[PDB]
Chain length 41, copies 6
Amino acid sequence: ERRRSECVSEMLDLEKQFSELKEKLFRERLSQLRLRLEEVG
Amino acid sequence: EDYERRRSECVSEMLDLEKQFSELKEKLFRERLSQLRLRL
Amino acid sequence: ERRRSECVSEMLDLEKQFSELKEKLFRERLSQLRLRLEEVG
Amino acid sequence: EDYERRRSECVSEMLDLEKQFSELKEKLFRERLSQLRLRL
Amino acid sequence: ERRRSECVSEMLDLEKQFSELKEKLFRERLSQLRLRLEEVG
Amino acid sequence: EDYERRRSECVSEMLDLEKQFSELKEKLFRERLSQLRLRL
Ligand SMILES: [Cl-]
Ligand SMILES: [Cl-]
Ligand SMILES: [Cl-]
């Protein structure tokens, strides 16, 4: 179980970072699209 | 622009669902981590 | 390879659950949207 | 409502693609697990 | 750290393949939709 | 067909974001792998 818990801990720690990265990436694309929408009018 | 608008709606929808999924994945990871550490 | 197979087994077991969670989450949002669509008419 | 309709189409499209991806990820996990267990 | 690095190496190797699979899956669906769009006209 | 068009825009948007995410995930994996191998 120790090999298993160290693996799961590591992946939780990475997934926490991947989640933040994905949300920030989507938010930037959403902001870019909303700005472009405005610029066209 | 309908074009920019439709694309923004798609991205907003997926952004909101991703935020919720992330929570759920993190919940499941921590739950399993606890279970392994407590031999449950 | 044993440390590796225990890591992969653990992650397959989690990913099986994450997949179900993601599909159920998308399905609920799809049902909510279809109901709202109907309610507006 | 075009608004609710467009959003529902986006979510349905992504739901269907996610269901397929999940299958493929599970396939690859099991394949690698087998290979490691059989030293292949 | 060795149990941890072997776990992370394994998962990086899988995620590299999952990424390719996801992009190819999305591309095929995009091509199918664009063809259908054309066929309707 | 507006129908096929809207769906194609949603998929194209998500395809482009997925390609970028994959890069970022791979970057983070390699960075952590290096750090663990170098005890950093
Ligand atoms: Cl809403
Ligand atoms: Cl279809
Ligand atoms: Cl663009």
